[PDB]
Amino acid sequence: SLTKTERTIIVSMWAKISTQADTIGTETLERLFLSHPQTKTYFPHFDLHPGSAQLRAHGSKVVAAVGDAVKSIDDIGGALSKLSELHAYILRVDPVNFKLLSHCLLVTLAARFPADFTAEAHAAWDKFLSVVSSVLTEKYR
């Protein structure tokens, strides 16, 4: 349920995010792991130390995924189909964690694009990330 305005805010903000995708992805994960240590257990095979190459490569894939959701904002479910199956059947990630990652991304955005991160932008992104999180956990319902 995204209004036309909210949708443009997501597209506009995405344009800027895509030019700093790699750093935004890495910072988001660092915030997640540090603020919510429980999330680290999903990456036992990962080098989660600062500047890590795995983390950096992974953070890039995550933001790219968010980008696909932007490109397919009208059918996020279809776009992220493969990922929802992976996170539910294979990774079995606790739904609460998606809310935690969403919060951390919002923090990264607010700190990186203060001028663009208004209340409305915030509401639009929270709503968008809620749909992305809902789609990724749909396999539990």
């Binding site: 910072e27 660092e30 915030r31 792991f33 540090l34 603020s35 919510h36 919060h103 951390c104 919002l106 923090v107 990264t108 607010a110 700190a111 990186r112 203060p114 991160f117 208004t118 209340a119 409305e120 915030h122 509401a123 929270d126």
Partner: protein, 143 residues
């Protein structure tokens, strides 16, 4: 509700570089905008019909001052959040009837605003510190 001295510093420093009163008003406003149902407890404040309106509502900014002030108190007593907020807890519980889940939301709003003001200074490690603080404050309020 423990904090490494290294962290104790971060929270002490960073909370200084920011304008507390603005944080509270903006955190409350974001709460009302991002979670429209929380508006139900503020019919008095007047016009909350839109974001810009909400963010510019005098009564909303004024209340944020008190919320941020209280938050600040618990910030000076991160070891006794229990009693510090005890009075407020029963006020939000028995009198205002606010579902405890909401306290956690405002805490997230505060965290986001801090990142909004401090920018690059609000680093991951710094956020973790404040999250623990925020988590503690909400816990006390619900407890």
């Amino acid at each position: 509700v423990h904090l490494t001295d290294a962290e104790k510093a971060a929270v002490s420093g960073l909370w200084g570089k920011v304008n507390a009163d603005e944080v509270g008003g903006e955190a409350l406003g974001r709460l009302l905008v991002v979670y429209p149902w929380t508006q139900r407890y503020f019919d008095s404040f007047g016009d909350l019909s839109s974001a810009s309106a909400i963010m510019g509502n005098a009564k909303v900014k004024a209340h944020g001052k008190k919320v941020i002030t209280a938050f600040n108190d618990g910030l000076n007593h991160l070891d006794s959040l229990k009693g510090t907020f005890a009075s407020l807890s029963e006020l939000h519980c028995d009198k205002l009837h606010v579902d405890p889940e909401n306290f956690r939301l405002l805490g997230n709003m505060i965290v986001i605003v801090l990142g909004h003001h401090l920018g690059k200074d609000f680093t991951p490690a710094a956020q973790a510190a404040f999250q623990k603080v925020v988590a503690g404050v909400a816990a006390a309020l619900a407890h």
